[PDB]
Point group: D2
Chain length 340, copies 4
Amino acid sequence: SMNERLEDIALTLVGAGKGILAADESTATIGKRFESIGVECTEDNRRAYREMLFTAKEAMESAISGVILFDETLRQKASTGQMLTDLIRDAGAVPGIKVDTGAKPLAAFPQETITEGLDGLRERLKDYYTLGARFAKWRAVIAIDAQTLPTRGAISQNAQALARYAALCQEAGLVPIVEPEVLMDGPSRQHSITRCFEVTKVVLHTVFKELFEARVLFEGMILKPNMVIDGKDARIASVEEVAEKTVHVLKQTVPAAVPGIAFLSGGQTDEEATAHLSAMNALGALPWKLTFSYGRALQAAALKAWAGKNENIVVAQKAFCHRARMNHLAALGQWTKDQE
Amino acid sequence: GSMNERLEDIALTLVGAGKGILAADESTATIGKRFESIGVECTEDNRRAYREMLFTAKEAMESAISGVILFDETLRQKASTGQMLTDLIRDAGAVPGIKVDTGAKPLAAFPQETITEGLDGLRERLKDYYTLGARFAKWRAVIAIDAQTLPTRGAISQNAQALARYAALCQEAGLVPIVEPEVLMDGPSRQHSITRCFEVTKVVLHTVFKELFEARVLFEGMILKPNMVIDGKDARIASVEEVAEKTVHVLKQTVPAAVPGIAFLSGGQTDEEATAHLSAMNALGALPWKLTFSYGRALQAAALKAWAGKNENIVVAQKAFCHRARMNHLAALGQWTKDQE
Amino acid sequence: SMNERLEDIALTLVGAGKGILAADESTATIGKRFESIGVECTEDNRRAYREMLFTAKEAMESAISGVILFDETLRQKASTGQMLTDLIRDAGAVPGIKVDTGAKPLAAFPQETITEGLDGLRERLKDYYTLGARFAKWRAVIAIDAQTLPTRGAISQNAQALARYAALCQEAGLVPIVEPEVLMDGPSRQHSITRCFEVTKVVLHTVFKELFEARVLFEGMILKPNMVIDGKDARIASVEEVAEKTVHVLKQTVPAAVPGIAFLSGGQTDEEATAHLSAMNALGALPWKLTFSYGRALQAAALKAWAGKNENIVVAQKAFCHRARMNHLAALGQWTKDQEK
Amino acid sequence: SMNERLEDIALTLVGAGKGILAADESTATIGKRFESIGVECTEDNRRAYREMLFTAKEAMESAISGVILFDETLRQKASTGQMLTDLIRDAGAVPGIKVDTGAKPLAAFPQETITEGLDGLRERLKDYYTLGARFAKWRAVIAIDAQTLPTRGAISQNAQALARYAALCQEAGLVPIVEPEVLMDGPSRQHSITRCFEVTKVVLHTVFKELFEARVLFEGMILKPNMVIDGKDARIASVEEVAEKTVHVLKQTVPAAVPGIAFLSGGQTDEEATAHLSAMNALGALPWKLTFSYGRALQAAALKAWAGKNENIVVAQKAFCHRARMNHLAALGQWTKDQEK
């Protein structure tokens, strides 16, 4: 019955061509985004920006199954006085909560990271459940170059921490989003799509091996991986190649028991993220749903149009709704260049 | 590259169009045991007659059987009409294959468990078998089971490791390998529950695929031949529906979608159980792989009884084989009923 | 060179027949110990009790290479105004810091635990180094019973956390004590010495495998294991058998590169813990130093004599000094029962 | 008692400054050696050559604890009509048998190998025991270059084959020599001593991990590794550095429970091989015996001097006796350059 509840939550998050808004940027990460448009990163600006997204009615009702939140935001109220989690729920979306405390340097493995956040997590999860969160998220950052990175050590240690995080979540009634990101836009980003395929394959294999050993219910989780794609500074793979290779790697490494895969955008352009997802959804019947869990690819246009100003709310919401809808169509395999 | 693509094509043919595999690969000792039960002397010539009878059941072979697993001897044997037995198989649109393991032997330091031998010289044997018309291969790992101590992690991993060594060799030779890790329902202990079989099978398939992965086996170019999740032969209480459900469940958790097909062993189930179970699994809606059969006993026991070692009974024994072939053909399509007989 | 420094500190911690006072009890644990002798667990009483131990100059100067501390104590002043760690350093002992945050229930593994503490551990270690700590400690708790506990999953996950801890300690300039305790005094305490042998074997093997994968420098760490011993409520093994079996499991699992092994007392009586260590050091040349890292076995008698009373300070110091000396003798293989009198 | 006998055999093989004569070269391998000095590789020349070694009284009695034999040689008679195994036993040396069937290309791992010979091994071992063999040998060949080779896969599969062999040996009552050789003299051989150090470390770690899992008794086996040394065409490591790094990697990876380590010479010169072993034994107390299992380093000079002629038996036996003695002194840490005179 815990299993049944988790299964139902996971299915709702990937159901009916809908997908996840990744709005869970930590203070430093959102500060970086805000700084790129010359906006000051205050708490009120963060609230106002998020409120603008979460009251974007069309997108929130028709396209967004869930929203991943950062801790601050989960506890924040709208200007109207209503809890932001309650706005999210009034649109028929499920609130979720990012619980990792960041990717930190891994001792003895230079240029690689290990994600922290397991300490006190049982207790944080119970609190988050009480506040209405029904899923969680943890991000593992996997560095990549032509040959030396990533190491098996870094992969295994990150997969082990993901498994620990995932078992705890399920124990508290929350569906874990498991995010192992092979970086397309890291410090080294000239790798080929072939190199990304071989690394992603080993990463997903190890991730699922560790989830298995830690007794994680595959039916009650969601995978949020990178697509198989070349590095940002060496992009030559076509939309078709990206889609074909991505789905090929998933067939090999993601058990059919997993109900959905919601991709990260990872540095891709807005249109790329949509085109790639759409082409994967026209490759014939798949054992899991393929959808989006996009941060940048859902937000970057909204953020630029917003520009920190109240008078830009509507025009910001339009950009967000438009990208939400294109990605909805992508989740249905129905997107075309013409619809942009 | 092109060769990988070819391995997929062969693998897909073996599990496509509601067809399945005839497991006719009994070793000398094994087929001898099956002959002794019906009072027929186990000689080369009787083994040749028996198998020729199966392969000349035209309608069964043409319409139901995609491939035949053969033992070394049979692959090199002539039919009484002068052609190779493999010619008959190919004339019926079926693909010949070859069992390459040398039997499940006792595993040092693991009492009551076995390890399968046959890797020595396997590269050269595979090359020879390909020139003899074999396009796929087979290796059985035998996994013991009881309530709590068997099977050990060690016995499973060592078997999984030999299976992977085998699979990589087959694929390099151009043969699709059938990977057969059987958790015994009919072993020395056989009063275990279906929940126990579920858990054991889960760890076996997990470890098998972990080792296939590490040995760089192409999942798209192989076939799995597992037991179904079933209670022990002497404590059968689980329903058809529960066997179907729990089997499909464990496979969705452990068998990658890249694998084109799963062809079940009958394992000591009755003819009708094996058929019903397969049909009820294909009635559960859409799945990531094909579900079909690779049955020995469940395709053969009845025909062998009707044959009874006598040339006069070729017609009748063929009838009884044609029937089972057709029933399991319907099961593969999810169209079997007890009514179809 | 920073590798060479870790080696030096580790060697110092197990050298010259000296050993480690394990005084790192967390608030709840030291509370339980004070409650037994009817003493209120206040910050002041904890300070008073630790100050009594650290001012027992005879024992601290002769027997104690190092002191494992809890966070609070590392930051505490003596009644005389020095830092408590000044007293420890003056006696020639090295201060150390326990850095784990406790053994919590492990999701999906009923009745087993996982140790927390890795979050922010880099920054804590850095800060702890500036407070004078030159080694650290982390405890994995491994439950045990006749057949089901511990699970391989619980050991693996606990070994993996240990390895993460150890790599961080060495990066920060501190020697990690790696403490995987198979409990003799948990809920199940009627298990055999054979059962402990088999479980400790798997625990230590798994621990050193994970340390190896996480690039831990074996030459710059200390192991603090349980001795191989039957459960507390089913004690049959003689002194010789415990010593022999313990050394045997260590020769099988603990690399020669490790400089010292400092045992936990684990529920054994004060005399048992002394006698077992002495017997182990009377077995001839070994590839690592064998000494003590005792809590109860160095403190139980001193605590009882102290009885939360300033007037009992001298008598408590004498009790501690005696047990320190006996254990000093054990570390040299020179203890006999005569010398308790 | 099985354990106790394996242990005793193992101890004898590394005891008292003695070491193993590796004379188990297969037909193809001995043919390469013979062709080098212009001698036809016939069965009679192989018999005559080995007879010459095994009747070198002084060398066989004082330096050689055991002789590894190829199958053919184990079944061969001397010119006098006596079994060669009896000649070996009459000098106080124990006969042993190499049981692998060669290092073959590993499917899906270009430029790497996997060693065959597990099939029918239980039966071969039982026959070898009856014939007087009391230990066995199996060689895994690990390719090496600057970055890409060896792969984890190749190491794992070879370690797993090694463990299967070792378990079977012990069951039949033979002590398995476990030989995992990182090549200094394969296709690529300009790798540095640091690179060899890292590769050898992962190899030895993986080997012992798999032996552990396969329930191999550490106390009843012998390791035969390469020394830690740079490639043949990039030799810069001093004698002292090789000795030091070799002993370092062994303390990291080879359990104290293992009674002995007997190095392969691996393409080193005769003198290097002796000097390195001697330096290693001058580094103070070690947890295991360190000695030799030399093929080329004990024979090259004898073979050259023999030159395929009966006329040179004495001059060949003299050159073999001198190397046997130089290596005996090395096993004792007593070799010097001056003793070559």
